[PDB]
């Protein structure tokens, strides 16, 4: 299976990360409309959520689901995370290898000022 | 019984040494471990000796 | 890949009327072709496997992977983690070229050929044939080899029944004894 | 005749030392156990012998979580 093999893949980075009570940054790589959101350490509510499925992001991008679209998400998350007074977060791969669009979404957050 | 003991002597100016065991009759090569030296306060590469 | 574009609008279109499918993705497609070579006698000579690995470098298009022993039995004197065979799992672009070279100019090179068995299916639609010579492929120069033992071609498709995968190979005329 | 048994060992004194709501000062061993019969939860650490030691001078509380129902040991903070 493709979906359930990734859930057990990320569970090591979920159960250990919520044990420390860290405000986590959960990314969800998809070949179209890559997602990213900021989740409170209680696990039941979120604080900042932004991606290319909204009409305020995809109108300035040619294709949603490549590297320069993932750079537009990670910049848009860090501009909204500083408005809530959230500086120190922890990145969550969510079962994706830190090579491509999940790295450019993490590089663009570290350029804007999201300290992790 | 088979696994005899050796002495990892520091290559630095001091004479501090760690002790350990090594099976000679199966893997006869010397150890080149890199542990902390408490006298020099450095991380000097250790060498095998008796 | 001559018969890759022939698959797109002369084989899929043919199979939509034989088993009355309703969607274009319901057609059985072929996934991979795996070339095992069960050398077996590598406990005596290690270079016998290296000569067996050199035969898949000419019959297939890439380097084989040696296969370690899954279990260990004493009836053949093998241990856990010993290379006892070698496989080539070719798929994608080079498999339509290998399937072109196999059924056209390598199956008629079989000595004492009457036809392939039509009952060699595993109840899912995956065909497996077995040949007994290397000289059915033109890439072997006939002087560097010293063993009669050939290989076995396994064609893995995405069918569900034996009749459903039988009509997929039947478009390539697949002589069907 | 003769016998071949008569051999055992120093009983290891395992089990739970501190139960339910019973204030434990940080670093206090709670459960001494063979494997992870009881798993470590909130504020409670797990040692190299699967001794769940407390980590915050508070209470205790056992639970069952996930989809395996493993008694779990947390620490209410008082």
């Amino acid at each position: 299976d493709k979906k359930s093999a990734r859930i057990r893949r990320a569970t090591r980075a979920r159960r250990k990360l919520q044990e420390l009570g860290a405000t986590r940054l959960v990314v969800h790589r998809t070949p179209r409309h890559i997602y990213a959101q900021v989740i409170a350490p209680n696990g039941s509510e979120v604080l900042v959520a932004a991606s290319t499925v909204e009409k305020a992001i995809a109108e300035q991008l040619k294709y949603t689901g490549n590297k320069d679209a993932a750079a537009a998400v990670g910049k848009a998350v860090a501009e909204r995370a500083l408005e809530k007074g959230i500086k120190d977060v922890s990145f969550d791969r969510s079962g994706f290898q830190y090579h491509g669009r999940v790295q450019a979404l993490a590089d663009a957050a570290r350029e804007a000022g999201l300290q992790f | 019984g088979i696994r005899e003991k050796i002495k990892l002597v520091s290559s630095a100016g001091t004479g501090h040494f760690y002790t350990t065991t090594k099976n000679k009759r199966t893997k006869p090569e010397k150890l080149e471990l890199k542990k902390f030296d408490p006298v020099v306060r450095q991380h000097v590469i250790y060498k095998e000796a008796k | 890949a001559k018969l890759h574009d022939y698959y797109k609008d002369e084989v899929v279109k043919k199979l939509m009327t034989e088993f009355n499918y309703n969607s274009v993705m319901q057609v059985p497609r072929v996934e991979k072709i795996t070339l095992n070579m069960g050398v077996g006698e590598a406990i005596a000579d290690k270079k016998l496997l290296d000569n067996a690995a050199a035969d898949l470098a000419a019959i297939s298009g890439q380097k084989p992977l040696i296969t370690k022993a899954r279990k260990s039995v004493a009836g053949f004197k093998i241990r856990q983690g010993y290379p006892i065979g070698c496989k080539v799992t070719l798929r994608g672009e080079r498999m339509w070229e290998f399937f072109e070279r196999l059924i056209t100019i390598a199956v008629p090179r079989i000595r004492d050929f009457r036809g392939l068995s039509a009952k060699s299916f595993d109840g899912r639609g995956n065909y497996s044939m077995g040949v007994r010579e290397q000289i059915i492929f033109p890439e072997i120069d006939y002087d560097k080899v010293d063993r009669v033992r050939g290989l076995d071609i396994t064609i893995t498709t995405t069918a569900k029944s034996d009749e459903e995968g039988r009509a997929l190979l039947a478009a390539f005329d697949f002589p069907f004894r | 005749g003769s016998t071949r048994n008569g051999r055992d060992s120093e009983a290891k004194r395992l089990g739970v030392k501190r139960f339910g709501g019973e204030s434990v000062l940080a670093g206090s061993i709670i459960v001494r156990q063979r494997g992870t019969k009881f798993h470590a939860g909130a504020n409670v650490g797990c040692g190299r012998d699967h001794t769940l030691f407390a980590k915050a001078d508070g209470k205790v509380k056992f639970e069952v979580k996930g989809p395996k129902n493993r008694k779990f040991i947390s620490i209410e903070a008082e």
Binding site: - | - | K2, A57, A58, G61, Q62, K63, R94, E97, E100, R101, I103, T104, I105, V107, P108, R109, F113, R114, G115, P138, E139, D173, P175 | -
Partner: protein, 66 residues
């Protein structure tokens, strides 16, 4: 695919005795001369000389001559 470990994949031009010139991608080398292809092979005519092989009454009447 990887580099430096795989053999050559140069396209060649095969040919049989029936004149069926067909280019393939293989690792033979310079050229290739073949015997038969999927066509012009005795597989659909090979079974023609197999059905009417048996029979002993028609063998007998050739020695009866009338």
């Amino acid at each position: 695919m990887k580099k430096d470990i795989h053999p050559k994949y140069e396209e060649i031009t095969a040919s049989c005795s029936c004149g069926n010139v067909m280019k393939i991608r293989s690792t033979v080398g310079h050229d290739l001369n073949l015997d038969v292809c999927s066509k012009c092979h005795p597989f659909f005519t090979g079974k023609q000389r197999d059905v009417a092989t048996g029979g002993r009454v028609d063998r007998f009447n050739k020695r009866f001559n009338i």
